[PDB]
Structure formats: structure tokens, C-alpha cells
Ligand binder design. Structure first.
Ligand SMILES: *[C@@H]1O[C@H](CO)[C@@H](O[C@@H]2O[C@H](CO)[C@@H](O)[C@H](O)[C@H]2NC(C)=O)[C@H](O)[C@H]1NC(C)=O
Ligand SMILES: *[C@@H]1O[C@H](CO)[C@@H](O[C@@H]2O[C@H](CO)[C@@H](O)[C@H](O)[C@H]2NC(C)=O)[C@H](O)[C@H]1NC(C)=O
Ligand SMILES: *[C@@H]1O[C@H](CO)[C@@H](O[C@@H]2O[C@H](CO)[C@@H](O)[C@H](O)[C@H]2NC(C)=O)[C@H](O)[C@H]1NC(C)=O
Ligand SMILES: *[C@@H]1O[C@H](CO)[C@@H](O[C@@H]2O[C@H](CO)[C@@H](O)[C@H](O)[C@H]2NC(C)=O)[C@H](O)[C@H]1NC(C)=O
Ligand SMILES: *[C@@H]1O[C@H](CO)[C@@H](O)[C@H](O)[C@H]1NC(C)=O
Ligand SMILES: [Zn+2]
Lengths: 194, 589
């Protein structure tokens, strides 16, 4: 009844440092049309089981989508560290949700090199869970301040993914979706087949 | 905010910026090498220029951080790699003069004419002819018309390079070349530039008797082809050694064969009578590599690589090469046919590729071999192991009723000795002469005298025609006209047999070492990948000690490899003289 279709085959996905959030409510959740797609590399679910997802319901469900590398997919998990798990997107230790990813070489790759996907590699401190950063202020490494212009020990904080079709499997684009389940004092409204 | 966090951030940024440019340059180079047109040269040159400019600009900024303030090891090696600078510490005019000299020298060697150009014409005459005068005139003409015109350029070259080397806190340009073997580590794993000369000199005194016996069987077998031009007690003339210079003696097999009736093992017919194509060759190579515990080739290997000539009117060079473009891209380019030599070069290049995939996890600056001699020695042992009768009998190209005759073994060993043992004195003499010339020990007015005296004393080869100081004989070689180091081959030859004996011992093999096969031995291939993953992140003493158990070069395995040939060669010299007296010259009368 609700679009778990406009999150999965959308034309354009978002960068990892600016990850898009979509909330689904007042609907019937069909989780069998996803697990039997046979086109998903990873279908790991934490805190619940994929078989019992149809029985117990919740109030709200949150969906986040972005694009990362092939060998950075394993960092989307509780208690994992790395370049993208502390500066771009973090998950709490007590997680209840699913992580879904699949290969996207046929779409997000060009011969001249796609350059519209970015990620952040410099930051002063780690990110709290479910926190997003958009600022592009120049990063300061030394004690001598630089006034808004990059120079010695002053670096721009974002860099681009050079996706090309000839890259290896570990350097090819992957599309990742994360679902989280919300249960609070509001009435439970999202659940499906009877 | 210390002098380590800044270096770490700088290294992060450099590592993530260099990959893009390197990949683009490699892609452009491959595209040009696959088509060779007029529009691809522009792109290749643009990519190369941009990459070089970026590297120079970044290496300029990396010298602002001192080395002694960093306590970690990997970061110290990364800064040491990024802080090297050659020809960038000179005045602009001197650099321009040096570049002009180098370009002129390379061009003048490239298009030399003797009276037929070198590459198509003179090489065939040197390789195939059997006439004394026919070889003599070509040799003398090439040397006179090339060396005489190259003397002042090389006289200026040594002075300019000495100035460049001294500007970088070095003692000599030869001392600058020897720095590729220098190490700095804990107590038991250091290495200095001075010890390389002593290490090379000691290893050469343990090879002389075998070389003397090989010299005395060739001298004695060429009595017949040339009746009255070579003395039974003198040195061999330089223009009767199978090449223009004498670097390899491999073209003397038809003249010096122990038993000329029994042929060698050739499996071209038993391979064409089974409809084998190139894909079968590479599949067999992959099966051999996966039978020893190493992984399989990627899917992009089979789609992007070139393994045959294109017959659609596109021009290619396709000298066999192995490419590591980056970002998980591995390709092999070869114009494959259905002979046995291609079947062995397939294994060689697959070994080259297998070494590259191991250290892809290391940082950008540490993705190379331990030193300049490891990367070729790794690929040579695969070809050594993949040409034994056991492997051919298991594959199917050789019938199971085959019999291993000892005369064929002697033939094989003699051919291998002519290929391998005959080139060590040449390399040692050339490198020693270049080091002594650079160091200033040799006066500028006695170059050719020292050159030919050293030839007579060490390699036992004499000139057919006397030469004054107006010539330049070393410059006729390719690696001297274009500045390249030449000590790689000695070390590679030692290392390959070191590794082969170690792995054959691990495989529990019995009998002579030249009949060793490491197929279907997971332990042997599992130990070898321990050093392949290290790359350049640890000193090459670690890399040597992990596999063989020693921290220095040893020539004992090489002599153990040629033991049956040493035993048989010693017996046929009873009624002959071993050694040479350097008082005989073929113009005395
Ligand atoms: C996103 O779009 C693709 C097609 O672009 C959908 O693939 C369809 O899958 C269903 C089964 O789930 C098939 O019956 C259809 O034939 C497929 N193609 C089309 C064009 O519909 C995919 O299911 C969509 N994702 C969703 C709905 O979550
Ligand atoms: C590694 O370093 C040590 C010490 O710096 C070298 O050992 C010295 O070698 C010189 C050689 O002339 C001797 O005179 C010293 O007495 C040695 N000192 C000690 C404490 O042993 C060692 O040679 C170096 N390793 C290599 C391979 O050169
Ligand atoms: C490849 O060699 C085989 C081995 O002898 C040849 O096979 C013989 O071929 C003749 C004529 O076709 C037959 O009458 C024989 O019975 C074959 N002998 C055996 C044992 O195979 C063959 O001719 C060669 N090439 C091919 C396949 O034609
Ligand atoms: C590397 O990839 C090759 C691809 O062919 C694998 O070879 C296949 O292996 C399976 C069993 O794992 C066989 O059923 C196939 O017949 C093999 N293919 C061919 C063409 O022979 C090989 O196994 C892979 N290596 C590893 C270690 O998994
Ligand atoms: C480059 O080579 C491919 C085949 O190797 C060919 O199809 C293509 O036309 C070549 N490029 C040009 C510009 O002709
Ligand atoms: Zn090679």
C-alpha cells in the first residue's frame, strides 16, 4: 500500500556524507517481496528475524539510502570502525533493523569517470549515532590558522569517487539501504498481511 | 599537533590523490599500446606530464618535515620514499644541458647505420653467420661508427652526474645507484652501500671453476668451425660469441652440443594435434597456479586482457608485458602462438601478475617488490618448475610411456649453463668498470686500456683489432647509452635458485634438484605468499629470511643445481688446458 518501491529503484541516489531519510507510516508492510528478490548481495537483519517481520508491528519505520564502495559495505554494522563508520554514517550498538546492498556497476559508472559521489575523510571528532554533517569548512591541522583559503596544512574535507566500469569488484559502486524500527507510546500502525 | 599527526594527514591526502592520476595515466598508456595511432600519443603525453608535475610538486612539499622526529617505521619509509629527489637540485641551465645530452645520445644510438641498421640487419648477421670476415667487418664497423661519435657526450655525462650526486650528499653517482639496497632497521636487519661491493666480490670467487670448465669446452669445440684462428691456450675473440657484445652465449648450442643425435623435449606437435588455443594455455597456467594454494584470476582479467593478434588492420607491438593499472585492474598483453616458448612465457607473466595481487592491501608508496631483483626472480621459478617432464606427463602433452634419458639431461643442463652461467662475468666486469670510472679511480686518458685489460683478466675475451682512446666500446650497449642500472641480473640469478632450493626442500623432493616440481604442494605455495604480501613495508632481509632462512646472498644453491654438469665437464678436460694466458693476441703475426 506504501512505497517500498520509490526507495529501491529510484533514478538518483544520494552521497554518503548527505544520506537521505524516508519515513513510512500508515501502511501494510510486505517484507516477503524483498527477501525473495534474489538480487541482493547482503540481507542481514539485527534485533529481529526476517521470517517473523510480518507478525509484530511498530509505529514508524525509517529508510536511509546512499552509495558506497564494495569493500566498505562491511562497515555498515554495529561496533565497526573505519573511515566511513566514524565520519559519514554510524549505527548504535543496540540496533534493530536490516542492511541491504547490491551491485550497481551497470548504472553508476562512466568511461570518463563519474565524479558526482563524494565522501568525507577529515573531521575533528567521531559522529554520534544517526548524525549528519553537511558543512564544508576548511579543515585545520596545524596551530596556525588559515583564513578560508587552502594552503599549508589546510585541506578541503571532501573527496570524490572515481567510478569507472573497468574497476575491480572491491572498487565498484554499491547501493545500500538501512531500515530502522520505531516503537514508542504512539499507536502501532504499520504492518501488513493477515 | 606534533610532527607525526601532520605527516599522517599529509600522507592520507597524498595516497587518496595519487591513485586517480596513476590510474588515468596507466589507462591512457594501455589504450595507446593496444592501437598505436596519432591521437592517442597526445592523451598519453598529457596524462604523463600531469602525473609527473603532481609528483614533483608534492615531493617538493614533503621535505619540510624532518625524519628524526618520527618514531614509527612505515611512516618513516613513506617519507623516505617521497623525499628522494634527482636532477631537481641543479640549476635550470644544467638540467637543460643534461636533458639535451641524454636525448641526443638515445637518438644517436637508436638510428645508427653501419656499412644496415642494427636491429634488423646486424643482429641477424651476428646471430647466424659462420664466416670470420663477415662477423669481423660488422663488429668493427658498428663499434667504430657508434662508439667514436659517442665519446664527448659520455665525457660530459659523467661530470654532470657527479655534480648531481654530490649535490645530494652522496660521494659519487655510482654510490647513488648502490643506494637501492640500503636498509635501516633494528640490530639484525641493516645493510649499507659499502657492503654490496664486498658481497658481490665474494660470490664471484665461488663461481670461477665452473666458468673455467665451460670456457675450456667451448674453446675446444670451436676448433673445428674455425680451423686456424683460435689458439688452444689463449682467450676467445670477442666476435665469435653469438651476439654483438657477448652478453649471452646461448647461440652456440648447434656448435657445442654433447650428443648431437638425440633431440630435446619439444611438445609443439603433441599440442597442435589436440586443437589447443590461447585460452587453453592460460587455463592450464591458472590450474597450475591454483594447484599450489594461490588464488584464481579475476573476472576482469578474462574480459579486458589481450591474448591474440588483431587481424582487423590495427597495429600493435605486443612485447609480452604484465600490467597493474590499479583499483583492482589486472591485464596481460601478449601475442600468443601455439609453441612451447609461449606456453612457458604464459607461466612467467602469470607469476608476475600473482605477485602484484598480493600486496594490493599495502599503502600506495609501498606497492612494489622488496628490491629491484625480486619481481623477476619470482616469475622465473614458475617457468623453471613448469617445464619438467613430470608436469608435461601429468598434463597430457607427453605420453606416459616416456623414458627420461640422461644424455638429454646433459644437453638440457649445458644449454641452461650457456644461458645463465655465461653472463655473470660480463655483468660483473661492466658494473665494476662503471663504478671505477664514476669514482674517479680511472684516469680519463686510460679508459679503453683498462676496459680491455679487465676483459682479458676476468672474462677471458680479447679484441681482434687494437683500439686507442678515440673509441668508446661500453657505449655500444643499450643499457649504457640510456642510463640504467645493470646489477639487477646478478642478484636475480642468485635469488631465484635460493628460492627454488628452499621451496623444493619444503616440498620433500628426492634426487637431483633440476628435476623438481612444486605442483600439488599447498605448504610450498603457502609459505611463498607470506613474503609476497609484505611488499616494500619491511626490509628485504626479512623477505629473504622468511623463505630461505638466511639474511644474505648465497651462491651454493646455484652450484648445487649444476652438479651433474660439473661432474661430467670435469672428465672431458683431461687432455686439455684449463685457464688462459693474457699474452696471446690475434694480430701479433
Ligand atoms: C524496482 O523496479 C524494478 C524494475 O525496474 C522491479 O523489478 C520488477 O520486479 C517484479 C517482482 O518483484 C517483477 O514482476 C517485474 O517484472 C520486475 N520489473 C518491472 C519492470 O516491474 C523491482 O521490483 C522494483 N523494486 C521494488 C518494487 O521494490
Ligand atoms: C649494522 O650496523 C652495525 C652497527 O652499526 C654494524 O656493525 C659494525 O660493523 C663495523 C664494520 O666495519 C664494525 O667495525 C663494528 O665493530 C660493528 N659494530 C657492531 C656493534 O657490531 C653492521 O655491520 C651493520 N650491518 C651491515 C650488514 O652492514
Ligand atoms: C595425431 O596423432 C595420432 C596418434 O597416432 C594419430 O592417430 C592415428 O590416426 C590414424 C589416421 O587417422 C588412425 O588410423 C590411427 O588409428 C590413429 N592412431 C591413434 C593411436 O590415435 C592422428 O592421425 C594425429 N592427428 C589426428 C587426430 O588426425
Ligand atoms: C577460481 O575460479 C575458477 C573459475 O573456473 C574455478 O574453477 C571452477 O571450480 C569449480 C569448483 O569450485 C568447478 O566446478 C568448475 O568446473 C571450475 N571451472 C573450470 C572452468 O574448470 C576455481 O575453482 C576457482 N578457485 C577457487 C580457489 O575457488
Ligand atoms: C582501438 O582498438 C579497438 C580494438 O582494439 C578498435 O575497435 C578501435 O577502433 C581502436 N580505436 C580507434 C580510434 O580506431
Ligand atoms: Zn619477467
Amino acid at each position: 500500500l506504501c512505497p517500498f518501491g520509490e526507495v529501491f529503484n529510484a533514478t538518483r541516489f544520494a552521497s554518503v556524507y548527505a544520506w537521505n531519510r524516508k519515513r513510512i507510516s500508515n501502511c501494510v508492510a510486505d517484507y516477503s517481496v524483498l527477501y525473495n528478490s534474489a538480487s541482493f548481495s547482503t540481507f542481514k537483519c539485527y534485533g529481529v528475524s526476517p521470517t517473523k517481520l510480518n507478525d509484530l508491528c511498530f509505529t514508524n519505520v525509517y529508510a536511509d539510502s546512499f552509495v558506497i564502495r564494495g569493500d566498505e559495505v562491511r562497515q555498515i554494522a554495529p561496533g565497526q570502525t573505519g573511515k566511513i563508520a566514524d565520519y559519514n554514517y554510524k549505527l548504535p550498538d543496540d540496533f534493530t533493523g536490516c542492511v541491504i546492498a547490491w551491485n550497481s556497476n551497470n548504472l553508476d559508472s562512466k568511461v570518463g569517470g563519474n565524479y558526482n559521489y563524494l565522501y568525507r575523510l577529515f573531521r575533528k571528532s567521531n559522529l554520534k549515532p544517526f548524525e549528519r554533517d553537511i558543512s564544508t569548512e576548511i579543515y585545520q591541522a596545524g596551530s596556525t590558522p588559515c583564513n578560508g583559503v587552502e594552503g599549508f596544512n589546510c585541506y578541503f574535507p571532501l573527496q570524490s569517487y572515481g567510478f569507472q566500469p573497468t574497476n575491480g569488484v572491491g572498487y565498484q559502486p554499491y547501493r545500500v539501504v538501512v531500515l530502522s524500527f520505531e516503537l514508542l507510546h504512539a499507536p502501532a500502525t504499520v504492518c501488513g498481511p493477515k | 599537533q606534533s610532527t607525526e599527526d601532520l605527516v599522517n594527514t599529509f600522507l592520507e591526502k597524498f595516497n587518496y590523490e595519487a591513485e586517480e592520476l596513476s590510474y588515468q595515466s596507466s589507462l591512457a598508456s594501455w589504450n595507446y599500446n593496444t592501437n598505436i595511432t596519432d591521437e592517442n600519443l597526445q592523451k598519453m603525453n598529457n596524462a604523463g606530464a600531469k602525473w609527473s608535475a603532481f609528483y614533483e610538486e608534492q615531493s617538493k612539499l614533503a621535505k619540510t618535515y624532518p625524519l628524526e622526529e618520527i618514531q614509527d617505521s612505515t611512516v618513516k619509509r613513506q617519507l623516505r620514499a617521497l623525499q628522494h629527489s634527482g636532477s631537481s637540485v641543479l640549476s635550470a641551465d644544467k638540467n637543460q644541458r643534461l636533458n639535451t645530452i641524454l636525448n641526443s645520445m638515445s637518438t644517436i644510438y637508436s638510428t645508427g647505420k653501419a656499412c644496415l641498421l642494427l636491429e634488423p640487419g646486424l643482429d641477424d648477421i651476428m646471430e647466424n653467420s659462420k664466416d670470420y670476415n663477415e662477423r669481423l667487418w660488422a663488429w668493427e664497423g658498428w663499434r667504430s661508427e657508434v662508439g667514436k661519435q659517442l665519446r664527448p657526450l659520455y665525457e660530459e655525462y659523467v661530470a654532470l652526474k657527479n655534480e648531481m650526486a654530490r649535490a645530494n650528499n652522496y660521494e659519487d653517482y655510482g654510490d647513488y645507484w648502490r643506494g637501492d639496497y640500503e636498509e635501516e632497521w633494528e640490530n639484525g636487519y641493516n645493510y649499507s652501500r659499502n657492503q654490496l661491493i664486498d658481497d658481490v666480490e665474494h660470490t664471484f670467487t665461488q663461481i670461477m671453476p665452473l666458468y673455467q670448465h665451460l670456457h675450456a669446452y667451448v674453446r675446444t669445440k670451436l676448433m673445428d668451425t674455425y680451423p686456424s684462428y683460435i689458439s688452444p691456450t689463449g682467450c676467445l675473440p670477442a666476435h665469435l660469441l653469438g651476439d654483438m657484445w657477448g652478453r649471452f652465449w646461448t647461440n652456440l648450442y648447434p656448435l657445442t652440443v654433447p650428443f648431437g643425435q638425440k633431440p630435446n623435449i619439444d611438445v609443439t606437435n603433441a599440442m597442435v594435434n589436440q586443437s589447443w588455443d590461447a585460452r587453453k594455455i592460460f587455463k592450464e597456467a591458472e590450474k597450475f597456479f591454483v594447484s599450489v594454494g594461490l588464488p584464481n584470476m579475476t573476472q576482469g582479467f578474462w574480459e579486458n586482457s589481450m591474448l591474440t593478434e588483431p587481424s582487423d588492420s590495427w597495429k600493435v607491438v605486443c612485447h609480452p608485458t604484465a600490467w597493474d593499472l590499479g583499483r583492482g585492474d589486472f591485464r596481460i598483453k601478449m601475442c600468443t602462438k601455439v609453441t612451447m616458448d609461449d606456453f612457458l612465457t604464459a607461466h612467467h607473466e602469470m607469476g608476475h601478475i600473482q605477485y602484484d595481487m598480493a600486496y594490493a592491501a599495502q599503502p600506495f608508496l609501498l606497492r612494489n617488490g622488496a628490491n629491484e631483483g625480486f619481481h623477476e626472480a619470482v616469475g622465473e621459478i614458475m617457468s623453471l618448475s613448469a617445464a619438467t617432464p613430470n608436469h608435461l606427463k601429468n598434463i597430457g602433452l607427453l605420453p606416459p610411456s616416456f623414458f627420461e634419458d640422461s644424455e638429454t639431461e646433459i644437453n638440457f643442463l649445458l644449454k641452461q649453463a650457456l644461458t645463465i652461467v655465461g653472463t655473470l662475468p660480463f655483468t660483473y666486469m661492466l658494473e665494476k668498470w662503471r663504478w671505477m670510472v664514476f669514482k674517479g679511480e680511472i684516469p680519463k686518458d686510460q679508459w679503453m686500456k683498462t676496459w680491455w685489460e679487465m676483459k682479458r683478466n676476468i672474462v677471458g675475451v680479447v679484441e681482434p683489432v687494437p683500439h686507442d682512446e678515440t673509441y668508446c666500446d661500453p657505449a655500444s650497449l643499450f643499457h649504457v647509452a640510456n642510463d640504467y642500472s645493470f646489477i639487477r641480473y646478478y642478484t636475480r640469478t642468485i635469488y631465484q635458485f635460493q628460492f627454488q632450493e628452499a621451496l623444493c626442500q619444503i616440498a620433500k623432493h628426492e634426487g637431483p634438484l633440476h628435476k623438481c616440481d612444486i605442483s600439488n604442494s599447498s605448504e610450498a605455495g603457502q609459505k611463498l605468499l607470506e613474503m609476497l604480501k609484505l611488499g616494500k613495508s619491511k626490509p628485504w632481509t626479512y623477505a629473504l629470511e622468511i623463505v630461505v632462512g638466511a639474511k644474505n646472498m648465497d651462491v651454493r644453491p646455484l652450484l648445487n643445481y649444476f652438479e651433474p654438469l660439473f661432474t661430467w665437464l670435469k672428465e672431458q678436460n683431461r687432455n686439455s688446458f684449463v685457464g688462459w694466458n693474457t699474452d696471446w693476441s690475434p694480430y701479433a703475426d
